[PDB]
Amino acid sequence: EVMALKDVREVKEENTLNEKLFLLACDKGDYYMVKKILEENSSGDLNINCVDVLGRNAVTITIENENLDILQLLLDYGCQSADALLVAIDSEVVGAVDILLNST
Amino acid sequence: RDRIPLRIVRAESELSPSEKAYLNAVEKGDYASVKKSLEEAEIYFKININCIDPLGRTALLIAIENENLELIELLLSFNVYVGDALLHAIRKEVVGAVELLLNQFSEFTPDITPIILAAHTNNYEIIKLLVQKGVSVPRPHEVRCNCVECVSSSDVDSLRHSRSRLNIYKALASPSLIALSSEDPFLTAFQLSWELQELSKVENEFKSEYEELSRQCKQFAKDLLDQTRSSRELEIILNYRDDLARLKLAIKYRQKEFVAQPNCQQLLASRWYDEFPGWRRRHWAVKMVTCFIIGLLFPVFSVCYLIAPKSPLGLFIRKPFIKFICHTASYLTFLFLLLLASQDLNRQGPPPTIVEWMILPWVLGFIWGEIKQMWDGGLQDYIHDWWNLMDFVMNSLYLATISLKIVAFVKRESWDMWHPTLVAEALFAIANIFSSLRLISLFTANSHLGPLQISLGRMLLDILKFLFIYCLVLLAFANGLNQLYFYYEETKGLTCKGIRCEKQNNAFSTLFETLQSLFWSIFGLINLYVTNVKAQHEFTEFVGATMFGTYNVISLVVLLNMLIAMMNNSYQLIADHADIEWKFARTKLWMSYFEEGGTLPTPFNVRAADNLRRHHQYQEVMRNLVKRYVAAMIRDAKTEEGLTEENFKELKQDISSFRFEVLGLL
Numbered sequence: 091e092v093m094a095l096k097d098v099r100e101v102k103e104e105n106t107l108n109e110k111l112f113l114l115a116c117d118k119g120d121y122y123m124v125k126k127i128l129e130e131n132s133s134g135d136l137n138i139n140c141v142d143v144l145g146r147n148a149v150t151i152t153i154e155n156e157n158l159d160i161l162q163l164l165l166d167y168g169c170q171s172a173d174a175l176l177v178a179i180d181s182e183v184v185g186a187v188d189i190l191l192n193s194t
Numbered sequence: 195r196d197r198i199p200l201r202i203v204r205a206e207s208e209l210s211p212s213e214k215a216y217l218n219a220v221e222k223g224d225y226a227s228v229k230k231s232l233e234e235a236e237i238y239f240k241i242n243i244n245c246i247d248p249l250g251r252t253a254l255l256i257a258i259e260n261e262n263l264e265l266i267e268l269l270l271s272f273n274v275y276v277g278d279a280l281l282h283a284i285r286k287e288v289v290g291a292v293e294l295l296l297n298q299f300s301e302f303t304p305d306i307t308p309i310i311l312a313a314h315t316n317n318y319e320i321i322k323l324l325v326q327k328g329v330s331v332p333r334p335h336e337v338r339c340n341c342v343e344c345v346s347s348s349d350v351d352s353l354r355h356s357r358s359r360l361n362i363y364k365a366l367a368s369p370s371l372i373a374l375s376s377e378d379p380f381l382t383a384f385q386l387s388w389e390l391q392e393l394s395k396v397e398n399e400f401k402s403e404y405e406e407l408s409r410q411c412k413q414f415a416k417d418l419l420d421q422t423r424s425s426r427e428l429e430i431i432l433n434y435r436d437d438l439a440r441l442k443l444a445i446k447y448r449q450k451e452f453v454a455q456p457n458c459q460q461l462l463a464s465r466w467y468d469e470f471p472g473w474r475r476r477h478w479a480v481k482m483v484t485c486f487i488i489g490l491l492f493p494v495f496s497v498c499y500l501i502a503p504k505s506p507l508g509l510f511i512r513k514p515f516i517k518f519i520c521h522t523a524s525y526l527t528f529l530f531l532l533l534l535a536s537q538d539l540n541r542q543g544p545p546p547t548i549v550e551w552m553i554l555p556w557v558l559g560f561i562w563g564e565i566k567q568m569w570d571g572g573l574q575d576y577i578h579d580w581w582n583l584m585d586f587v588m589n590s591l592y593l594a595t596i597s598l599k600i601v602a603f604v605k606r607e608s609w610d611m612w613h614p615t616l617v618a619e620a621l622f623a624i625a626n627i628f629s630s631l632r633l634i635s636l637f638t639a640n641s642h643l644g645p646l647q648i649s650l651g652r653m654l655l656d657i658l659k660f661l662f663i664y665c666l667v668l669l670a671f672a673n674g675l676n677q678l679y680f681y682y683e684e685t686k687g688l689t690c691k692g693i694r695c696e697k698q699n700n701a702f703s704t705l706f707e708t709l710q711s712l713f714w715s716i717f718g719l720i721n722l723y724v725t726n727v728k729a730q731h732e733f734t735e736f737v738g739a740t741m742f743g744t745y746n747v748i749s750l751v752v753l754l755n756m757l758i759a760m761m762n763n764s765y766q767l768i769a770d771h772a773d774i775e776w777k778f779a780r781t782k783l784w785m786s787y788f789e790e791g792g793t794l795p796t797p798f799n800v801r802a803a804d805n806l807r808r809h810h811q812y813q814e815v816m817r818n819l820v821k822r823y824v825a826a827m828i829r830d831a832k833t834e835e836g837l838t839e840e841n842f843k844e845l846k847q848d849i850s851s852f853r854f855e856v857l858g859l860l
């Protein structure tokens with residue numbers, strides 16, 4: 091016979107593909123495209139915060155990948171921190187901690 | 195000629211200069227030139243789309259090792275020859291293999307499917323994508339399987355079959371596939387570790403690979419225990435059963451990494467010191483005083499729970515530490531009885547009631563305890579522990595002593611040497627030796643002497659492996675000395691024959707005396723004049739002397755120091771990680787004393803809804819565990835890692851592609 095393999099622990103929900111496009115946009119550094127996605131969030135088709143496959147939030151992609159423009163972009167438009175200052179401390183960066191002042 | 199001519203004997207394939215320019219532009223990550231080259235390749239030109247380098251670097255494969263998503267999209271757009279490039283994207287550990295999923299010699303084994311290479315590379319996202327596409331791994335056969343078709347496949351290609359089984363077992367033992375596809379990854383890790391151990395036992399070749407796989411599975415189980423963060427989660431995991439049933443399973447499957455976990459040892463120390471706080475915090479003299487007064491007052495707690503089990507004194511035996519203290523107090527009382535038994539003149543001895551009559555039942559209680567151990571575990575569990583073997587021979591000697599005393603009862607310097615009294619006394623002495631050597635197994639509970647005893651216990655195998663070679667050397671030299679020295683066997687005027695006399699004589703007359711003399715020659719207890727015969731034959735005396743000398747050289751100078759060196763290396767390898775072995779042995783002792791059976795020391799022992807709730811609780815807590823575990827290995831793999839040549843190639847090629855894109859724009 092042949093053993094059948096399947097995702098017995100698939101807790102991650104696919105939801106919409108636009109979440110995946112937005113999460114890829116945070117991983118590429120397109121500031122204006124993520125601004126457009128936040129304008130769409132203001133429209134309301136897709137949410138600001140989406141936990142990915144790796145169990146991480148968008149601000150964690152801003153912090154761990156160490157770029158501050160998109161982090162200031164979601165901080166201007168409003169976003170869910172969800173234990174993100176500890177992640178900023180974890181990356182040993184000073185600037186993102188300073189804007190954050192202005193799983194574990 | 196004085197010059198070696200050089201040429202390519204295996205010239206392989208060759209490329210056109212336009213094909214070389216195409217491949218070089220693909221390596222540079224160029225948009226415009228590569229797109230133009232494929233556009234002229236659409237019409238009839240020299241440039242072939244499926245150009246393969248003699249290095250096996252197709253433009254498809256080069257772009258896979260180039261990781262440029264736009265370039266690989268361009269190449270799949272005009273339908274290049276897709277061969278094994280999916281497996282190359284799997285090996286490169288790039289998430290861009292989904293593009294190939296949405297769409298000559300081979301570097302990989304023909305057995306390797308994408309899931310096997312994905313499990314080998316141990317990337318969570320790649321394996322998740324592959325199992326989301328819908329993929330079933332081939333079934334490996336059993337460790338002692340009997341299949342006619344698999345036997346015939348071994349007869350056709352044994353090498354390909356063995357490589358196939360190794361690849362399948364390497365795919366199954368991957369931690370990501372276990373965490374992603376298994377119902378119970380702890381049970382799967384245990385069963386897979388046992389299967390890999392038995393596979394390494396059966397397959398003497400490829401043993402290192404299977405041992406590495408088993409250690410990787412054990413490390414995965416230990417890491418999954420590391421990810422826990424609550425005593426409630428530990429109580430859910432270790433008490434799960436389909437009572438610390440999972441900890442029993444870890445004990446049985448020999449998971450020393452799982453068992454010696456600091457959190458698991460925290461739970462075990464909490465359960466062992468049942469309602470006994472501050473025992474380590476108090477002073478050493480104070481805690482030894484408390485241990486001495488509990489062990490001295492042993493009969494009052496052991497008489498309780500036999501008449502009044504619900505009494506607080508009856509419930510004092512419920513604590514496993516008090517049970518261990520009572521058991522060891524009973525054993526030192528047995529050894530005290532043996533000591534007073536060591537400290538008349540009749541053919542058959544009446545039973546010495548004063549000190550040697552209360553030993554009889556205590557031995558009977560020991561026999562009952564060993565019978566209860568025989569019932570709990572079968573024959574392999576009893577023969578697995580060497581201490582159960584020592585207890586078995588101790589009880590056999592004690593039963594033989596009792597039987598010989600009875601035979602003497604129903605039936606000095608005058609009795610035959612085969613009188614049952616003398617043999618009974620000798621058997622009692624050897625049983626006393628074994629019973630008092632039984633105390634060295636109680637050092638596992640202590641922290642200072644535990645690793646010492648465990649290291650000795652698992653270096654005894656190397657000691658025996660050396661003593662086999664010593665046995666062969668001893669037999670050879672004894673045979674030689676027998677053949678040389680047995681014509682001078684003295685028979686007249688000897689008040690004492692053998693080496694065990696005040697004046698040593700007849701040391702090498704027979705084989706048994708030669709074995710004894712060559713054994714005692716190690717410790718220097720055989721004098722030099724045992725090689726001097728009464729006759730004048732000085733040549734045979736010299737040959738015996740030089741044969742004794744050469745043996746003494748081989749035993750003392752060569753083999754003994756070889757044993758020292760082998761012990762040095764073995765103790766290095768053992769005390770590299772002997773602490774986990776000691777904690778495993780201490781957990782075995784503690785959990786043997788955790789059972790409700792055997793609560794009495796050897797003196798005085800002579801539903802579907804609940805299962806569904808436990809299953810859902812274990813499932814939820816272990817979704818939490820695997821989420822923490824994959825977060826941890828993603829975090830770990832992102833740091834303390836060398837970039838090496840491939841990362842520099844990607845980083846430089848991105849700047850090259852950016853420069854060419856800017857030059858195209860401007």
Ligand SMILES: Cn1c(=O)n(CCCO)c(=O)c2c1nc(Oc1cccc(OC(F)(F)F)c1)n2Cc1ccc(Cl)cc1
Nearest residue numbers: 661662664665668693694706708709710711712713714716
């Ligand atoms: C414990 N012991 C012992 O007491 N005597 C004295 C008996 C009366 O003198 C012995 O002669 C005696 C003995 N073990 C013995 O074999 C060993 C084998 C392997 C290792 C070893 O250890 C070391 F490597 F040598 F250190 C010793 N032999 C020798 C022997 C005697 C009879 C027979 Cl059939 C076979 C072998």
Ligand SMILES: Cn1c(=O)n(CCCO)c(=O)c2c1nc(Oc1cccc(OC(F)(F)F)c1)n2Cc1ccc(Cl)cc1
Nearest residue numbers: 735736737738739740741742743744745746747748751752
């Ligand atoms: C095996 N052997 C021996 O049996 N006898 C006893 C013979 C009757 O007494 C010996 O005297 C004897 C002997 N090997 C001997 O030289 C060794 C050389 C190197 C190593 C060694 O080993 C160790 F380092 F010592 F361990 C020993 N010598 C000494 C000797 C005696 C006479 C002569 Cl001409 C030359 C050398």
Ligand SMILES: [Ca+2]
Nearest residue numbers: 567581582585
């Ligand atoms: Ca036992």
Ligand SMILES: [Zn+2]
Nearest residue numbers: 335339341344
């Ligand atoms: Zn088979």
